Ligand binder design. Structure first.
Ligand SMILES: O=c1ccn([C@H]2C[C@H](O)[C@@H](COP(=O)(O)OP(=O)(O)O)O2)c(=O)[nH]1
Ligand SMILES: O=c1ccn([C@H]2C[C@H](O)[C@@H](COP(=O)(O)OP(=O)(O)O)O2)c(=O)[nH]1
Ligand SMILES: O=c1ccn([C@H]2C[C@H](O)[C@@H](COP(=O)(O)OP(=O)(O)O)O2)c(=O)[nH]1
Ligand SMILES: O=c1ccn([C@H]2C[C@H](O)[C@@H](COP(=O)(O)OP(=O)(O)O)O2)c(=O)[nH]1
Ligand SMILES: O=c1ccn([C@H]2C[C@H](O)[C@@H](COP(=O)(O)OP(=O)(O)O)O2)c(=O)[nH]1
Ligand SMILES: O=c1ccn([C@H]2C[C@H](O)[C@@H](COP(=O)(O)OP(=O)(O)O)O2)c(=O)[nH]1
Ligand SMILES: [Mg+2]
Ligand SMILES: [Mg+2]
Ligand SMILES: [Mg+2]
Ligand SMILES: [Mg+2]
Ligand SMILES: [Mg+2]
Ligand SMILES: [Mg+2]
Lengths: 134, 133, 133, 133, 134, 134
């Protein structure tokens, strides 16, 4: 029984795909443990979530996009939640994300990709404590 | 341009209809301005939310049901949000709720009806202050 | 808590709308208690099912249509199943059937209307005994 | 068996609701007989399409909106297409449009209402000749 | 033109995914030849359907689950129906079943996996004769 | 930013999957640049579109099927539109087209496969000029 951190990005709200994305996870039978809505995440919170990408050239545009609209932070719980939800998510690249996945079906840009999902146990614990410090 | 208070009831979670419901409101172009997830709402918030029904026969069952599962409290914003979302919601009674409405399509019980929505400007103001103080 | 008799008509199969129809009833929380697939219903079951229309002008076309493809007979159970599913069904006439109802959304002919549903306690009892003796 | 004129408005494109709308009509069994995509409809076609509203207060905003994005003009054919598709469409006013209708479900503005549909035999004949001469 | 045996398992009825599953097959354009509804399959009928798994450690739980609710037995017919419907079904394992498949989209357990589908010509003939002895 | 040619084939209209197919592309966020409806494409226009398959044994049946009903020609525009829409389309073969793709989900025949999509830059330019000579 694992717990994973998921972010509904600003492009979801702009395109009205919020329920679509959450429904795909809900239908997979994953249970919401914690959920927080942000009218606008603080840039610092974002920079922390993506601290691994600070040296990348897209870092600043990435941070700019993540504060350009509302965000929903969610902790999903279930057996092997981390890897499973990653597979539902789909590849970061629009040239690779398979049809049937969230990105494969709905995302068309490598930056604006609708959804974040922790990629491992270590980073899950880490990202859960960033969005739900309590 | 109004704001209304919406509750996603425990039966929505039990039946995995959370996204479905929020989806029907999202497609009508209403924007979220506040949202909070309750693994279990405090008994007293529920009793105050339904303070008007405190002397009604179903009151106790109504509250028991409201704390029997998680709920989501949501403030929706849009032009004439209150009356419009009430329209989406559908009648409390399964015998009167019209197909195409949330309850008319999905709900089959007068008590377990999936969704709450403020019924007026004044009540919306109270209910909003109850869940987001 | 009632039981009602539902027929999935041949035009549902021709248009691949079988799951769609059964889906709208399933989402309303009604449970199946009996189900039988007919690659071709016997002419006499049809004529008895519609025994009330035997002297009507459309009777022959109605029966011809009912045996022109497969059908599914289903007994649904739920609190007030008869009136509620009738509501989901929608008016026989394409001019009167409301959007959000099965026929109102999907059907476009007074004869080929996709679905049958008992219209009362008494008729439901007969129709159920016709298809599941 | 009638033919009616349908316009898929710019807000359908902006909100990616094009397929959704055309889908609701396709499921009702109406067939396309003519279709044309306009990256930007000519101002004069719009003003003639709405020639009846030329003296109304909203006329200018209505036209500005109609040329602010792409549109799709479609001739639909089916038995009683005009009145039926009008029914699918739903009331112009967000306060009156019923859930289950196109506008009632998706639209939230009296001006930006996603879809146009001829309102009579005579008007359908004019509107059809305007977009497909 | 092949015929294959399909079972809608008890978890479908509990979660109200019956129409969802059948609709995915219907949209693929497969035709129903035979269909039987069981309020509760007899354990023996189940033990026969899974006679190959009698020595497995999950056999008894498997049988217990299969009689815990209603079941729909269906014979679908179409060109290469057996292999095609298997691919729609998706892997038994939730760590493998791909998004876009029935299990990949809706199943989250290796036991409660919503749907059975014959895996070959031999077993199809065999399973069809178990549920439709006529 | 590429442009690709897409054809909604006669089997889509017969089965009422027109909106379904276009919606999958629309949700992927591809923009319609040009669109033409044909009550019946001229056989010659079809023979040109498939001039590469003139020596194949299915050529004539292919052409017969393509004029057996209405067709919608569409130019979609977007980054890498050609390869992406191909992946949404799915393999020509029903034994290969993956679930989650258009053909994988809806097509069950190798001939009647619902949708055409240019396979490269060269053929896109070529097919766009066939259906939209202007
Ligand atoms: O070349 C890239 C790689 C990533 N990102 C953005 C998108 C992604 O959501 C975020 C973090 O990258 P990742 O962790 O590799 O993506 P994922 O979200 O798939 O883990 O950085 C880019 O804009 N360009
Ligand atoms: O006879 C009744 C009436 C209402 N309720 C419950 C359901 C409803 O959600 C809540 C409040 O009732 P309401 O405000 O009259 O209904 P609505 O929620 O439609 O405003 O009380 C019952 O259990 N039994
Ligand atoms: O003018 C008519 C009326 C009815 N029927 C067919 C359609 C209907 O399914 C069946 C039985 O009619 P009904 O019981 O009056 O309609 P419903 O099925 O809505 O109860 O007869 C016609 O073909 N023409
Ligand atoms: O008060 C109004 C009434 C109408 N319109 C626009 C919306 C409508 O699409 C168009 C034509 O109006 P109509 O023909 O009366 O509405 P409908 O489109 O429902 O026939 O004018 C407005 O902007 N404001
Ligand atoms: O490790 C396992 C393997 C299988 N099963 C159950 C699920 C499956 O539905 C049934 C038969 O197994 P299978 O034939 O290998 O699965 P499939 O249904 O994918 O053919 O046994 C388990 O509970 N645990
Ligand atoms: O063995 C075959 C191969 C192809 N075709 C038809 C289907 C296809 O749509 C068309 C062109 O073939 P293709 O370009 O290889 O298919 P695709 O549309 O996947 O590019 O010829 C057949 O009928 N049989
Ligand atoms: Mg990562
Ligand atoms: Mg109240
Ligand atoms: Mg009758
Ligand atoms: Mg007008
Ligand atoms: Mg097996
Ligand atoms: Mg090719």
């Amino acid at each position: 029984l694992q717990r994973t951190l998921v972010l509904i990005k600003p492009d979801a709200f702009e395109r009205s795909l919020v329920a679509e994305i959450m429904g795909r996870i809900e239908k997979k039978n994953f249970k919401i443990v914690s959920m927080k809505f942000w009218s606008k995440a603080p840039r610092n919170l974002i920079e922390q979530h993506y601290k691994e990408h600070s040296e990348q050239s897209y870092f600043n545009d990435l941070c700019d996009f993540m504060v350009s609209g509302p965000i929903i932070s969610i902790v999903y719980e279930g057996t092997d939640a981390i890897s499973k939800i990653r597979r539902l998510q789909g590849n970061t690249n629009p040239l690779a994300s398979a049809p049937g996945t969230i990105r494969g079906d709905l995302a068309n840009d490598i930056g604006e990709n609708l959804i974040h999902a922790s990629d491992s146990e270590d980073s899950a614990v880490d990202e859960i404590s960033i969005w739900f410090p309590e």
